[PDB]
Ligand binder design. Structure first.
Ligand SMILES: Nc1nc2c(ncn2[C@@H]2O[C@H](COP(=O)(O)OP(=O)(O)OP(=O)(O)O)[C@@H](O)[C@H]2O)c(=O)[nH]1
Ligand SMILES: Nc1nc2c(ncn2[C@@H]2O[C@H](COP(=O)(O)OP(=O)(O)OP(=O)(O)O)[C@@H](O)[C@H]2O)c(=O)[nH]1
Ligand SMILES: Nc1nc2c(ncn2[C@@H]2O[C@H](COP(=O)(O)OP(=O)(O)OP(=O)(O)O)[C@@H](O)[C@H]2O)c(=O)[nH]1
Lengths: 150, 438, 427, 427
């Protein structure tokens, strides 16, 4: 999953975008949000939401896996997220149930993160030097055209 | 621009020269043809390669190296080998008779009639050359051919072109192992004849290489191919700064300024930290703290000098690969805080740092690993005089019994130089002790 | 009109100048190719201060880069803004320095000094009226020190009438890299202090303190280091080039900030540094900018003047603010900590209020302070130099170069005089 | 405008800090992300007592968390309302404490106290003017006590003009789990009584009793325990942020409730508890409200007051009440049982009436009163200390860290003094 945020004061960006991992357990239907850790990130990584169950609507309902699918958004204690895609045992089990899977989608990348490092591109062009090959290969080789001018 | 001249004297050192040029061809993709694949960069000779190879308009990177020897065996073999077209023909200079380990034989009886040719070749390099920062001579003290001839040629170059640098690596005599009992004689002769003409001398030993090989390379049956690959990697490290681009760079000028404190004394020691195998580097981890502790680990040094026996003057560290100076200087600070290491008061600062971003290189069919951070250690300290003491307390006995001096007088020399060399040494040890005196 | 010619020397300069220029280009809106994009009237209108006019919406930097090893020139030209400089504004020798200051100071310079003087007078007469010159280098940087000493010595008599800003960096108290750094420092200072008027001090270890306090990004780059210090010099230069009812001239700063012929060394300082989440976890108010600017951690120049006292301070705030917050803040600090000031001068603060901030943020500032802080620095250099001179180690190269020990002796005498004077005036 | 700065320490006191802050946030209607949901103009008016503002509608709390164990702060940070705290506001050490006292009192505090003082002085300068501070910790907690002793010691002198609310929890009479626990408490209580003004006295055994009295749900969570304590603490704070014909200041309560410099121990009291039938089976009338207030079971601090005698009592009322009914309630209760008050001061009752209902019900109250009660508590802990000091079991760690028995001796002298003093005021 991922989520967006807006920076009010910093020099670089309107916005930052962050990736996260969601683990839904099968034991007590707890869920946990974990951010992967990347160096020089300038954010406190680690654990973001400890072990507990989660509240969909006011009454006290609980996000039973019977309602989750690909391509779904959901608001959770304020901050809202969007689901991109899943992994092997996840879709196998979920189709064993028979939840109709939705077409996948690209996970975006942080422009701040890329501009931190570099443009990943190509190089190499010098000036123009291949005379030896022509000279040796084509020793005294000439052409003979008969042309007419009016 | 920035380029040197490679000198490889002695069928002692020609195999290691062969190995090092073989290693050099990989990272630039020099094929044993001598020409590049499709991607064109050949031109006015302006890119990294030009520091080592003089590609003329031929498309053939020809090295600025010269091999000189008095045995035709190995040189004929190599010109029958693979890189024979790579090498230029008569910069492979050959003779027919060897010095038979005799320093004087290698210095006088034969030295007259080949210096002329090598002079011609070195000048015909130097003319087209423009940078001429210095020379990388590779020789041997116990030279069955190399020793005396090398001393004479470095004498003549010192007297003719005195405005550039001179660097020397050498295999050192094995302190408790011998290959020819001529070794104390030829060693002392070379040393004292060269002391007033040698800028910087670095020392390597086969026993230490071997011990490393079965301690961390963990292969009990090594080869010269292994020895030569390791030392070639060392020299590749020491020249990477000149070769490529980097955040900050250092040069032989800076080396000859900072490392040596005084006149005379110019004998530091080399070390390479991440000397380890592929599987180790694979499922272990590499980083600056542990490699830094390793560089001061006392058992990886290629000279059998006990650190706590001596004390330190200079430390030049070349960090090659991916690093930032923060943890680097933090680690060197932690080492300064460490108590066992004993800096003299002469050097409250002694840390010449050089950072080159470009990671090092593996070789196909090799035994090294896919390093990211390497650190090469060039340190000058007092713990080496033990070697000189070991040499002299045997030189004296062999002098007293005067065996093989009949050989030397028969080949036409005397005892006066042998006499004076010993107090030359004694002066060297006394100066070591005086500088150790705080 | 009044303008400035920039000078960059030494390998440190070879990167710092690049970073500083690219930041200024970002500010005034010049694309790397060099074709102006009109978005700010003021940036369009106060540009002749540094940029001269080329053809077709393009502009030349009035900066001069010097070095000896063409590899640095290769790197600078290959950089993101190397194309914006001129080949003519590059000049190099054909040898290495190896930071033997004597080599650079009697042998390596004598053959490029003439050419660099020709180029600099070319640019000066190209301009109309200068405020002066600023030169960026290291006092421990051998090539920079050796070149800059002679350069300033010549420009002093050639133009005895302009502002002589020197922006040089300081060796690390914990590790100096180069062992001869004490020697280089002495050979620099002994003439720098008598040729210059204003000297800045900047410390890498303090930068790393900054990283471990507010950057909190583990592994930084010297590029980011250059980013910060370039921002500092940009801030000190902004006042001249923007509208607003404030005083600008570096002379109007120096007359306030310079009591004595021997008082030259200053302590920069920057304003709000955002932490990882402070971007949207902070509140941008004049009081808290003031509190942050006058904080020990924010310091980056030399070492804590908590030991010492303060003589003068000049603060330049930037953005739409009001006279009253700055006035009351200065009175507040004056009455709050009224002991660590010096009774000699009353009201040691000098205010400047620029209207237009840097692009993106609302209110910012920068600091400079003359206070007793460099004392332990040159005390350490004194002890290093005495320990080295005690046994002439490494000195034979200079003997061969044609140097004599009397020079070292008068240099150490001069630095002892500065130590004694700085201690004496307030203690 | 007058504000309060809040301190959070000790692994429990941290529990309580989280729960208390989230309770206040929910009352004032704030999302987990800090964006206000407009419902109550009055609450928006008075938010400024606790919450600063960060640009973009973000009300950064004026609280500080301090501890030494990284994982605890990871947990509180990753709680559903942990994001509202600041990365700036997280000072901590890289070590454990061992649930020692002298360790956190000498060995490790000395290198954290500096940072906490710097941050607290920053925020103190940021805010305008203070009634005082409030601390959440554990008297029995190792790290919490080891910090708080030194903290209050440090703040007393330079801030001798404000009110230092102290909030902690007594270990159970039957069991303390931790065994060095009375050693720690007998160390701390000395400095606590030395530096104290106001102290809330709580133990969780009575709280388990209350749960089995009226919630009847067998198994709660310490989270629910902290829900209850959070409500009890909120009780006092309700006054400032709401209008009404009452007096709000902690001094307004404290000078009244404190007859002599040696009275700082106060017992909570709460409003009608709810059972699953009570939501529609209660009879919400001030008669039974006050009956419950002085219901022996309603008491939740330590133990039965009917052994002792009351000294002062104060009731804060929350809702649209009238004063005559509570006044005649006080009349009637005096008539019925005047016996267990004292002749020292008649009319021991004070009534403050805040008029904004709580979130969930219309009218409620919080009771805070001090009586001749804590005798058996500290008497019990005193036999504990006599037994343990009979041969000085476990002393060797404390001696190795550096301590001496004489300090224990004057401390126990102090507690015996408190025994005698309270016994006499009763007698
Ligand atoms: N340089 C070098 N030394 C080796 C090698 N293998 C053993 N050695 C040591 O190096 C010394 C070689 O020196 P010399 O015997 O004088 O060599 P030389 O003068 O060229 O004459 P040759 O022995 O015939 O090669 C020996 O004593 C060995 O201790 C090797 O491959 N290269
Ligand atoms: N640009 C740059 N300079 C650095 C950096 N770290 C240290 N420096 C210092 O900047 C100084 C100035 O460099 P130069 O004046 O160009 O070098 P120099 O005159 O040849 O003398 P040296 O100090 O021996 O290099 C160097 O001495 C370094 O000590 C860095 O990361 N980037
Ligand atoms: N967070 C938390 N604390 C609890 C809980 N239950 C009891 N506590 C109390 O927390 C007390 C100690 O907390 P702290 O004040 O942080 O003490 P400390 O200085 O960190 O060192 P310790 O007392 O050894 O934990 C224990 O003595 C318990 O009485 C709980 O369920 N959660």
């Amino acid at each position: 999953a991922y989520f967006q945020e807006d920076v009010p004061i910093s020099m670089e960006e309107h916005y930052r975008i962050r990736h996260v991992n969601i683990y839904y357990y099968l034991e007590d239907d707890s869920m946990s949000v974990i951010e992967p850790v990347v160096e020089n990130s300038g954010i406190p990584q680690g654990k973001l939401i400890k072990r507990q169950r989660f509240t969909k609507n006011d009454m006290g309902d609980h996000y039973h896996w019977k309602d989750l699918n690909r391509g779904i958004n959901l608001t959770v204690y304020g901050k809202t997220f969007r689901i991109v895609d899943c992994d092997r045992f996840t879709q196998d089990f979920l189709e064993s149930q028979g939840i109709e899977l939705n077409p996948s989608e690209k996970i975006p990348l942080d422009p701040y993160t890329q501009l931190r490092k570099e443009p990943v591109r190509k190089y190499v062009t010098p000036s123009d030097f291949d005379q030896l090959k022509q000279f040796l290969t084509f020793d005294k080789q000439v052409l003979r055209f008969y042309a007419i001018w009016d | 621009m920035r380029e040197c001249i490679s000198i490889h004297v002695g069928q002692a050192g020609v195999q290691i020269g062969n190995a090092c040029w073989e290693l050099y061809c990989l990272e630039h993709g020099i094929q044993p043809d001598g020409q590049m694949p499709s991607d064109k960069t050949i031109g006015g000779g302006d890119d990294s390669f030009n520091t080592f190879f003089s590609e003329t308009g031929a498309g053939k990177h020809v090295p600025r190296a010269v091999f000189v020897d008095l045995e035709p065996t190995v040189v004929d073999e190599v010109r029958t080998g693979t890189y024979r077209q790579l090498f230029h023909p008569e910069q492979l200079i050959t003779g027919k008779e060897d010095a038979a380990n005799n320093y004087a034989r290698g210095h006088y009886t034969i030295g007259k009639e080949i210096v002329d040719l090598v002079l011609d070749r070195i000048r015909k390099l130097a003319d087209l050359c423009t940078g001429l920062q210095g020379f990388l001579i590779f020789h041997s003290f116990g030279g069955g051919t190399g020793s005396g001839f090398a001393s004479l040629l470095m004498e003549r170059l010192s007297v003719d072109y005195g405005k550039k640098s001179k660097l020397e690596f050498a295999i050192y005599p094995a302190p408790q192992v011998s290959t020819a009992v001529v070794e104390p004689y030829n060693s002392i002769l070379t040393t004292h004849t060269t002391l007033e003409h040698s800028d910087c001398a670095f020392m390597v030993d086969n026993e230490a290489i071997y011990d490393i090989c079965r301690r961390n390379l963990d292969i009990e049956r090594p080869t010269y191919t292994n020895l030569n690959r390791l030392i070639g990697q060392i020299v590749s490290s020491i020249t990477a700064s000149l070769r490529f681009d980097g955040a900050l760079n250092v040069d032989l000028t800076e080396f000859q300024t900072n490392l040596v404190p005084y006149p005379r004394i110019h004998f530091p020691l080399a070390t390479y930290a991440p000397v380890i195998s592929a599987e180790k580097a694979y499922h272990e981890q590499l980083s600056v703290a542990e490699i830094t502790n390793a560089c001061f680990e006392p058992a990886n040094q290629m000279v059998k000098c006990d650190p706590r026996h001596g004390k330190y003057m200079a430390c030049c560290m070349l960090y090659r690969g991916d690093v930032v100076p923060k943890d680097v200087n933090a680690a060197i600070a932690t080492i300064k805080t460490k108590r066992t290491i004993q800096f003299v008061d002469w050097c409250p600062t002694g840390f010449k740092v050089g950072i080159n971003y470009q990671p090092p290189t593996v070789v196909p069919g090799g035994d090294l690993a896919k390093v990211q951070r390497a650190v090469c250690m060039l340190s000058n300290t007092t713990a080496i005089a033990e070697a000189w003491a070991r040499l002299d307390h045997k030189f004296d006995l062999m002098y007293a019994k005067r065996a093989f001096v009949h050989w030397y007088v028969g080949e036409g020399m005397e005892e006066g130089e042998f006499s004076e060399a010993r107090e030359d040494l004694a002066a060297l040890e006394k100066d070591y002790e005086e500088v150790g005196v705080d | 009109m009044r303008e400035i010619v920039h000078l960059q020397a030494g390998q440190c300069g070879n990167q710092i100048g690049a970073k500083f220029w690219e930041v200024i280009s970002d500010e005034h809106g010049i694309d790397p190719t060099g074709t102006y994009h009109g978005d700010s009237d003021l940036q369009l209108e106060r540009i002749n201060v540094y940029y001269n006019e080329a053809t077709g919406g393009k502009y030349v930097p009035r900066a001069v880069l010097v070095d000896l090893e063409p590899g640095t020139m290769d790197s600078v030209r290959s950089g993101p803004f190397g194309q914006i400089f001129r080949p003519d504004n590059f000049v190099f020798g054909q040898s290495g320095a190896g930071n033997n200051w004597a080599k650079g100071h009697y042998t390596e310079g004598a053959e490029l000094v003439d050419s660099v003087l020709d180029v600099v007078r070319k640019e000066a007469e190209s301009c109309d009226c200068l405020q002066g010159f600023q030169l960026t280098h290291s006092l421990g940087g051998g090539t920079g020190s050796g070149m800059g000493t002679l350069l300033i010595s010549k420009i002093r008599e050639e133009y005895p009438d302009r502002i002589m800003n020197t922006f040089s960096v300081v060796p690390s108290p914990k590790v100096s890299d180069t062992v001869v750094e004490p020697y280089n420092a002495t050979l620099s200072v002994h003439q720098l202090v008598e040729n210059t008027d204003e000297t800045y001090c900047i410390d890498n270890e303090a930068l790393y303190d900054i990283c471990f306090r507010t950057l909190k990004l583990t592994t930084p780059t010297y590029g980011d280091l250059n980013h910060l210090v370039s921002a500092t010099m940009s801030g000190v230069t902004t006042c001249l080039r923007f509208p607003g009812q404030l005083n600008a001239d570096l002379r109007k700063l120096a007359v306030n900030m310079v009591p004595f012929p021997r008082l030259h060394f200053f302590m920069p300082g920057f304003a709000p540094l955002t932490s990882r989440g402070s971007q949207q976890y902070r509140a941008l108010t004049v009081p808290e900018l003031t509190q942050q600017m006058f904080d020990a951690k924010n310091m980056m120049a030399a070492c804590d003047p908590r030991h010492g006292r303060y003589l003068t301070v000049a603060a330049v705030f930037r953005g739409r603010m009001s006279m009253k917050e700055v006035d009351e803040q200065m009175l507040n600090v004056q009455n709050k900590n009224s002991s660590y000031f010096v009774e000699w001068i009353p009201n040691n603060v000098k205010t400047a209020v620029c209207d237009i901030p840097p692009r993106g943020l609302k209110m910012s500032a920068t600091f400079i302070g003359n206070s007793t802080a460099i004392q332990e620095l040159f005390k350490r250099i004194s002890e290093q130099f005495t320990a080295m001179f005690r046994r002439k180690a490494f000195l034979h190269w200079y003997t061969g170069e044609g140097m004599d020990e009397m020079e070292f002796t008068e240099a150490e005498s001069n630095m002892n005089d500065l130590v004694s004077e700085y201690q004496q005036y307030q203690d």
